[PDB]
């Protein structure tokens, strides 16, 4: 009740950490995935997703 | 609460306007940087910039101009009111010409 408590803090702090790593990691790879996008249809879908993603990054980062 | 349910129909149009003024400023600043890293070439740069610099003056010198300067005054200022960083832009703006 006392330990489990102060250890719920560590409990999350580590797993969130990973997502963050994971997300930034992703956006770098996603940048490398950059092709013959003349499809302004697909460029938008790339944007949408990068944006979408980054939102999730900062949101997490924020917590801590 | 996104839009205040007591925000003038005419005001809604004014926000939309600022959103454009903003849009110009931050965008321009990049263009310029890109040109100082050759990414874009002169031919390209001078048209596009000139174009922007023109567009800007128009937004302010729109019919509903009062409200602009009003809640969102003289420009170097408005750049601070909003967390906006653009050390190039602010020179490309206050000087109304690109290549010089």
């Amino acid at each position: 009740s006392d330990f489990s408590e102060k250890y719920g803090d560590i409990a999350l702090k580590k797993k969130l950490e990973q997502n963050t790593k994971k997300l930034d990691e992703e956006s770098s790879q996603l940048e490398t995935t950059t092709r013959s996008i003349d499809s302004a249809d697909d460029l938008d879908q790339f944007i949408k997703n990068y944006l979408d993603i980054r939102t999730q990054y900062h949101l997490r980062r924020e917590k801590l | 609460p996104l839009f205040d349910n007591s925000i003038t129909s005419k005001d809604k149009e004014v926000i939309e306007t600022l959103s454009e003024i903003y849009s110009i400023v931050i965008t321009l600043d990049h263009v310029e940087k890109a040109y100082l890293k050759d990414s874009i070439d002169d031919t390209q740069y001078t048209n596009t910039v000139d174009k922007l610099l023109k567009q800007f003056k128009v937004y302010l010198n729109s019919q509903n101009k009062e409200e602009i300067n009003k809640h969102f005054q003289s420009i170097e200022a408005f750049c601070d009111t909003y967390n906006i960083t653009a050390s190039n832009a602010i020179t490309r703006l206050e000087r109304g010409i690109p290549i010089t």
């Binding site: 956006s27 940048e31 950059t34 996008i37 302004a40 460029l43 944007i47 990068y50 944006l51 980054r54 939102t55 999730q56 990054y57 900062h58 949101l59 924020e62 | 609460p1 996104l2 205040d4 926000i15 600022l18 959103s19 454009e20 903003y22 849009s23 110009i24 400023v25 931050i26 965008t27 990049h30 263009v31 940087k33 890109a34 890293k37 990414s39 874009i40 390209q44 596009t48 922007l52 909003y82 967390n83």
Partner: protein, 58 residues
Amino acid sequence: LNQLYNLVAQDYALTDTIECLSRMLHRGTIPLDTFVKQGRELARQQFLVRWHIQRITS
């Protein structure tokens, strides 16, 4: 409550995207103009977000 919290992320996120677009433009990926269009459409969006915070943070 988290209405703002969630919004905050957007402002940063957008900034991050536009930066990326810039990098993309530098390495040629997009034509020198598509950048402007896509860029402005993002910035414009951003402004609203930022200003939207002013509503709350005021």
